[PDB]
Structures are given as C-alpha cells and as structure tokens.
Subunit: 284 residues, 3 copies
C-alpha cells in the first residue's frame, strides 16, 4: 500500500527517542553493507536495537547490525543507523525511509549516506571511495517512490527537486578533507544508480547501466536521499566500491555478498577516518 | 491490486452520466497541469465534480480542478476532464484510467490528451507546444500497466498494439491547423516519456532520458493512451513545454510546480485556441 | 504482497506430484506461446491440469494449454509446462515462478525455457531460433523480483549471481546439435529483454530496447530463470522469433498475438526436433 505512516507515527517515534537519550544530534549517518564499524569511533555511545524503537523496521541483511547508535564522533553529536533497510527485503520505500523523517523530527539537519557498490566506471578499483555526485533512480521511473501517495506538507512539497540532491559545499569539503588525509588513491566521484535486487546484475544489464551514465550500482540509498531532500535535509554520501562488475560475458567471475563484506573491512579504517573528519566540515 | 473495476462498474457510471446530461459528446479532452482553462470556451456547459460521479477518483493535485465538464467547443459537443489523476497520488493505473473507459461507454470515439512537460530536446523552448507522435512507457517496462490482470474482451484484445497509438491523420490536421493560426513558433513534435514522480529529475536521469530518444518528460498521459487504444478510441494529444530540464550538474536552477503552472497561463490562450480549432478536424 | 508461499507449500505440491506419477524427471521444460506442441513427442505421457495440482496458478493466455505433462522425450524423462504464467495476467512473480521451485523439490536439475519473442536485432528473421545467452530484467530494475522478501536459504542464497545464468556448456552443445540437424539458417544467439506487457511496444520503445543491447523482447522467462538459478538449477533456453518489431514510425504494420501463434506452428517442428535432440546433451 502507499505510505502507511501518519505524521503522528513519525512524531511518536521521535518523542520516544528524545525521552530515552539526552543526546541531540544534528547529523545522521546511515551505514551500508560492511560499514557498521563506523560506530566504533563514537564516544558517549547509546545504542537502541531497531526492535526497541516504536515503528522501526528490522535489518534482516547480514552485515547490518540493526542498531541506532547515538554518540560523539570527532566532537560532533551524531545518530548512526548501523545497518539499513532495503526494498529487496520486502520493504516498501515508505518503510525503508521511515528513520529519515524521524531524524528530521529529532532536529537533525544533515544526512550522510554510505553504501557498498559495484563499480561500473572502468577506472574504479576495489577499495575506491566514490563521492556520490548524482543518482539515477530506476525504481522511481516505474513509480516505486517513498513519496508516492498523498503529500505531507509538514515534511515538504508535492513536487520536490532532486537535481541538487547532493550538497555542493559538502562534496568540496569532502575533497579537501581527502587531501588532508594524504591518501594515495584519488577520491572518486560519480553517479550512483539504484536497482531493486537482490540478485546481482548480468553482463548485459551492467553494460546497459554504464551506458546510462552510471558510475556505481547498488540496491539502496536513493530512496533515503529523496525523502531527506523532501523534508529539507542537507545530504551527502559515498559508495565503497566493493567489486568490479563483470562487464564481459563469461569473464571468469561473479559477484558475491562475501567479497562485498570482506572489502568493507579493508576499506573500513579508510572511510571511518574520512567520515569522522567530515564531521568537522558539516556546518551549524 | 490488479484492476478492481468490473465491466458493470464502468457501465453504471456511464448510465449515471447519460441520465444527468442531455449532451452526447463524441470527443473527450483531458486537461493536464495549468490547462484547466480550456473549459472556458465551452458553451452550454454542465459541470460535475468528480466526487458526484459514482466510482470516479479525486484530483488532489493543485491546478487540477477535479471537474468533468460537458459542453460545446467550436460547435462540437465534448466532455472535458478539468484535471486528471496521477500514479504519484497513490492511484493505481486502473483508477487513473477509469474515466477513459467510461467515455467509451458514453459513445465517445476520440480522446485528446494534454499535459505539462519538461523539455528534453534542446531545441524546445518554454511555451513550445509538442504534438505527441509517440511515447515511452517506463512504468510499463516493469509491469505497472492499466491493462494488467484479466483482459475484458468487451473493451478490447489481450495484446493491443501501441505503435500506432497517436492517430496519423489528426497529427497532420494538427499541423495544418497550426499553420492556419499563423503562429510564429513552429508546432513541435516528438516522443513523450512517462515516469512515476512526484519528484523532479536529476541531471543524470535527464541525460539518460534524452539518450533514450525522449523529447519531453512527464508523469501522466501514457496510461490513458494505452487504455484508450485498447478500447478502440482515436487518440491524439500534446505537451505544453513548461520548462527546460536541467541537463548539466549545478547549472543554476531546479524545476518547480509553480513555474509549471505559471507557464500554463502564458500558453493557455495559445493551446486553448488550438484545441477549439482542432474540434473541426476531428472526424465523424 | 511479497512471496506468499512457505517452503512447505512447495513441498506439499512436490509430494502430491511424486505420489501421482511414477516418473522422476531430471529435466523440466517450460513451453511458451505457440510452443505447446513439444509435448506431442512425449511417450509414456501423464498429464495434470494446472487446476488439479495443489497451489498451481492458472494459464489464462490463448496458446497456453495449462497442463503439466510428464513423459519420455528422446529416451529422457521430463516434465513439461504446456503453457506458462505471465505478470500481465495479474500474477506476481512469486506465483509465476511457483513451478520452478516445485521442480527443484521433485529432483529436477535442469530447466529449459522457451518463449515467443519479437526480434530487435535487425539480422533476425521470423522463424529464427535465438539461443538465450543473457538477459535484461527491466521489471527487476524497479524491484519487481520473484526473490523479493525474506530469503529461503533452503532454496538458495540472499544475493544470487546472474551473470552465469545461461549454462555455457549447454549453449555449446546446442550449437553442435543445430549443426547435426543440417539446418540452413544459422542458430541465432543473443540477449533477451523482458518487459511487463500486455500491450506491444511502440517504435520509440523498440529503438530504446535495441539500443540497450537487447536482441529479442518478450513478457516472460526471466523471472523463472532467476528463481531457477537461485535454487541451483542448470538453465538454458531460446526464443522463437515470431515477429520483426516495428522499428520505424508508421512503417505499415503492427504486432499481434495471432501472427505470434501462427509463427509458432511453422517453426514448431523445427524447435520440437531441436529440443528432443538436446535431451541427449543434457548431463546426468
């Protein structure tokens, strides 16, 4: 069905959270596959299992702890989604994106999204970090959109713009921070295309996706970004290139969630330091 | 769920309409965003709010009055949908397209569809009128189709052809009429691509859509055309180019429903005269 | 809703079948539009109407007999789906693909899929047989996938690979068999793209599909292949090019299910002999 949550449902969850923690984060971070380690840098951390939070869905995917963690990251108060929800789990987008609106009602102003992704751009290598400059919402083309149904004007407008989805200032700061890190490999950047999943792409599909102008492919993020932008949140994020997608038929190989998770560990420290540093650049 | 309306549901609504008006139009016109002024030229006009008509859905979008108006346009009896329904409102296509089949059961033979659209073809300018020569149904690729489910043979066949959707004769007459109007700007023509919405497209999505061979993009029309063709209605229509879609990242701008509606006013008189004149060209 | 069948539902149907036939096929064949004649070569044939089989959906499309036939084809025991299910019938993919998992639970190891398809590659001619080398799942891009929802690990993994969907060895054997047949026309090969239907494509849509790298277009097969691969079945199949899709606007013509079915008859004997011979090449 279309969005089942009323404005009050979001409000109730927000109030519940506010009454269970003294922390008041202005930044929210959604950790994708193999990126749950970001919470490790949090001090004064308070954890809530998704099942404790009224109205919150459940992370069923491996590598998605399913915990909402409040804490200080590089002197900045934040709330992290250690694990997220995906359409392929059977969740409609209005459920997948539930936390984003709750965050808005908590006083959050900035949303950082991260995910594991397959590289479509041939110049990418496993371990690359790609700053998301733009996206292509394939499910959206068919009408599968978290905003489908009556519009809640207390959140945003009926026809929100998406061309400026990823904050220009933050991406600039992101590049500056990367340089301060003295990293060898250049900070990649590009377009992230989202598809439903859960199966991995065929060679024909990959070629098509690259030809559409996509740099990385995944099964998440985009719906959260759309909902964030609809309610006025500043958004920025990145994809951890966990694998090079098979672009030629029978080229000895096939993607697997194992390599995805395993990759998240080698580049864990990398993006973990990066995100912590970015906290300082996030305004307010 | 799949189509919930039985053949009788359509019949009941048709009979209700026939018993409440003496008018018997052979032409139906669906007015899109900012095009509700077309009813203004109607004489002997009788209006029914969608909420009065048994089984009729509700227009919730601004600029969509939500009234079915019967009247004479240029000496021709017609029924106009002052406002339409969209998938992004939460309506499945079988609800969005309900009126089209009712029109068929009223004796209507021709359907004129109009809409506001973003220009993908760089040669288009705001205020341009694009005769729809063909379409690309993105939601249809995924199976979201008003014809999905058991086929009602009393309406049409199981596998209807769409390659000849837009009547060739009418488009020719349309061009001739435009010339008689002595209009400075040439009558544009092209392919209309439909996507779900309600958010506006990203730059990457726009580039992709243009590359797919689309001339204009919108969130309506196509489902009505498919249903019309399935039940044997002659179809023709056009898009009012209300805005030039941002084709380059951060090129100082973003689409908005306001500019869309505001544009519909400047080009209102334009397409209003055009449609009135086309009445004479519609056969029978 | 997401998959409604529990593991037990599949098991119950499998046990029912095993207790009603002594046959134990290791190969399953799904016959598409106009290909129901393949059962004619079966000896020791036992037929079950889909309506007799607990949990089985119903074939509503003409040319789809709706019978599950057990028998010997070229000395090899097989089970054939004389007719299949399609999304456009109103069936969610978890219902369309129900038989594939039942086959797995019957001891089946190989799945042969066949279908009628429109040719996108200009080199194809009506009557051509195209070995499916790869596919493009458009509905999958939007999330419409038979695997959507909680994953049944007793069938397969959460994120199955699809790049190797069509068995390389079988396609090689397929080509060898074709040569032994002394056929004049070369055995075609390519990518099959699936879309929802039930309407036939517009010219713009066709151009787009070809540009995406598709060789043939249809409204089936892909979901069955995904489910087959998820549960470990060896898969291979082909499309009977029943028509050349209109690639140019108003080029005197339009597709129809009649020509589709009529074509299946001329090339019936052709692919019928071909499939029977392939039985010998299928391993185990």
């Amino acid at each position: 069905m279309a969005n089942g949550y009323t404005y009050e449902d979001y409000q109730d969850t927000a109030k519940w959270l506010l009454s269970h923690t003294e922390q008041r984060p202005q930044v929210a971070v959604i950790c994708g596959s193999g990126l749950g380690g970001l919470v490790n840098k949090l001090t004064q951390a308070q954890t809530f299992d998704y099942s404790e939070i009224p109205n919150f869905p459940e992370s069923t995917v491996p590598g998605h702890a399913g915990r909402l963690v409040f804490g200080i990251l590089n002197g900045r108060a934040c709330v992290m989604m250690q694990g997220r929800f995906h359409m392929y789990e059977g969740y409609p987008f209005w459920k997948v994106t539930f936390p984003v609106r709750v965050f808005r009602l908590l006083g959050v102003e900035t949303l950082v999204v991260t995910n594991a992704a397959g590289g479509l751009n041939p110049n990418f290598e496993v371990g690359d970090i790609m700053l998301i400059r733009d996206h292509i919402n394939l499910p959206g083309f068919s009408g599968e959109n978290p905003l489908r149904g009556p519009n809640e004007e207390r959140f945003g407008v009926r026809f929100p713009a998406m061309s400026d989805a990823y904050d220009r200032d933050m991406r600039q700061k992101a590049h500056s921070t990367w340089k301060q890190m003295g990293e060898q490999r250049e900070l990649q950047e590009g377009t992230y295309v989202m598809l439903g999943g859960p199966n991995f792409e065929t060679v024909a599909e990959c070629r098509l996706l690259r030809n559409l102008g996509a740099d990385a492919v995944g099964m998440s993020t985009v719906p959260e970004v759309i909902v964030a932008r609809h309610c006025g949140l500043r958004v920025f994020g990145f994809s951890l290139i966990t694998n090079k997608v098979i672009m030629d038929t029978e080229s000895q190989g096939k993607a697997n969630h194992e390599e995805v998770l395993e990759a998240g560990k080698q580049a864990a420290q990398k993006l973990e330091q990066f995100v912590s540093l970015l906290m300082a650049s996030i305004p307010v």
